[PDB]
């Protein structure tokens, strides 16, 4: 809706950054709204959804088991590993790693999962094989969050990320069970409260994944809709600014509020 585009442009001003935005119909895939859809932005933690999508794909093909238990050591722990740092002794299952990576944005979990599929190259290969010739992952956590301007490593496109998320959640790419597990993990997202969620009214469904950089970049992918069911995909990315974390979030929230109001 035009009033949302106005809010996006207003966000660029308040942020002093570029903002990528796109709304996709969950069922038809039709584009409902967009801004800088073809421009690249660093994915940051939003890639974790794609990662578990790839893990679930292997599970569907009999090449991985959500129940496999993985052991690791102190040397595997990177910054911000709220769950994994609590299991150096007993380890964690692939299932638990995806939960930690998506719902808590655990970085070590993301790396451990990257290791199971063969690293960044493989995630990109996976995306490539399903039709996404745009999105790409090149590095591990935490380096993938550098967000050096114009650097195309670990980046995606609002349009690419949107269509990819949609194929992951509704196509036949993943089995019914995997499709359902992925969205359940996103719906249980615990660290995106001040973003789209703070503008989502009671009764609405939302499954999302957010990301942030040290330079101020911010991102979020989500499937949301009224009446307890998702009916739309929304992708938002920003190029980084010096605005306070609270100010950055507020802008995302206001975009969401406009998205809801003119649903």
Describe the SSE topology.
Blueprint: H1 2-15, E1 19-25, E2 31-35, E3 41-42, H2 47-60, E4 69-70, E5 92-93, H3 94-103, H4 107-117, H5 120-129, E6 155-156, H6 158-169, H7 176-187, E7 205-212, E8 217-225, E9 232-239, H8 245-261
Antiparallel strand pairs: 1-2, 1-9, 3-6, 4-5, 7-8, 8-9
Helix pairs in contact: 1-8, 2-4, 2-7, 3-4
Family: Belongs to the class-A beta-lactamase family.
Catalytic activity: a beta-lactam + H2O = a substituted beta-amino acid
Pfam families: Beta-lactamase2
Overview of this structure, please?
Helix content is 38%, strand content 17%. The protein contains eight helices and nine strands. It has helices at 2-15, 47-60, 94-103, 107-117, 120-129, 158-169, 176-187, 245-261; strands spanning 19-25, 31-35, 41-42, 69-70, 92-93, 155-156, 205-212, 217-225, 232-239. Strands 2-1-9-8-7 form a five-stranded antiparallel β-sheet, sandwiched between helices. Helix 1 (2-15) runs antiparallel to helix 8 (245-261), helix 2 crosses helix 4 and helix 3 packs across helix 4 (107-117). Keywords: Antibiotic resistance, Disulfide bond, Hydrolase, Plasmid, Signal. Residues 25-238 form the Beta-lactamase class A catalytic domain. Belongs to the class-A beta-lactamase family.
Radius of gyration: 17 Å
The separation of the N and C termini measures 8 Å
Kindly report the spatial arrangement of strands forming the biggest sheet: 2-1-9-8-7
Shape: globular
How large is the count of helical segments? 8
Largest sheet: 5 strands, antiparallel
CATH superfamily assignment? DD-peptidase/beta-lactamase superfamily
H/E order of the elements? HEEEHEEHHHEHHEEEH
Look at the helices and sheets and give the structural class: alpha+beta
